[model samples]
Target: KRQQRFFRIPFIRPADQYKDPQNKKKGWWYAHFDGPWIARQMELHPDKPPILLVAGKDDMEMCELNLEETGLTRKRGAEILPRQFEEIWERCGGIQYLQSAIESRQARPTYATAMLQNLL
Candidate 1:
């Protein structure tokens, strides 16, 4: 509804409930959407190959269609850092993941998707 919507957040991993130092291996999730549909997604477990998703699983897991729905948007921390996102995206090969999605012709079309395909 506004400009680019890239929101990152951390959700507690169930097993971290027993880990030492309380430094839970929480996962970082990145959700970028075109209004309601997820255009692309990224995830970091700080271990696993940071799963990536594109608009076609017909899209989604966290957050909601409306910006006001998650209760994260109106808050201060969410949707604030693009650098953190871009940095992670490149490392995780989302650049390639998204490109593949476009070629698959399954991901939803959006300005973000178009630019991403162009980049690839």
Candidate 2:
């Protein structure tokens, strides 16, 4: 029997204004999540079920946690940005590969589910 595996999105912490001695007011510019691990998982499990990323706009006090502000939140069920889609495509495979798989009905739908208001 195959071993079951589970994955969870990492929490992104607020920027530490005091991290820099020279520029104490600098906001966080780095992402704390594990993108490479997710990419590797996708590469290893090409036939796995679809993946979804959920975020809430009013879940936290920071804008970074806000799905709508980060482009993860959809407005009126609008699609995510093409550039973002391309990024995911690149992570999985090249555009041609993704398109071919999609056209051949071999690709699973990976979705991003976001909430416009507080999700609690």
Candidate 3:
């Protein structure tokens, strides 16, 4: 079995994102770990619909890393509850997003995907 998953989608200024201080518009960046690999990603912008991305389909956009590689497991004050991500994901129509990915056979099979499969 895989390790328990964790979430991070804080509601504040992105510290790493503005490292260069170009002053770009700050948007919500959400991530859910299916064990060590990413399973779902949700990027929300005020002027656009939430961008829902899956592991394989959006690997270019998604961060491919282990929990230890990202240092997220040790990173504090960056974690959020599963329900938090779930709420935003639902509001963003993530189910449809995953469905689209499934049709394309681009989504990797993760624990989250298993749940989705079970949901259906």
Which prediction has the highest lDDT against the true structure? 3
- Where is model 3 more than 4 Å wrong at Cα? 1-4, 9-26
* Model 1 misplaced stretches (Cα beyond 4 Å): 18-20, 58-64
Q: Per-residue CA lDDT of candidate 1, range 65-119, in tens?
A: 5555766567677785666777888898877777777788876787668787666
Q: TM-score of every model?
A: 0.77, 0.21, 0.78
Better of 1 and 2 by lDDT: 1
Distance from true location, Cα of 17 in model 1, Å: 2.7
Please give the range of 10 consecutive residues that has the lowest summed lDDT in model 2.
111-120
Q: Model 3 scores what on Cα lDDT?
A: 0.76
Candidate 1, position 57, lDDT = 47
Tens digit of per-residue lDDT, candidate 2, span 9-114: 2222234333655433321111111221111121222224333221122113212332234442233433333343435535544444434444565443322111
- TM-score for candidate 1, residues paired by index: 0.77
Q: Which window of 10 residues has the lowest lDDT sum in candidate 1?
A: 57-66
Alpha carbon lDDT of each predicted model: 0.70, 0.29, 0.76
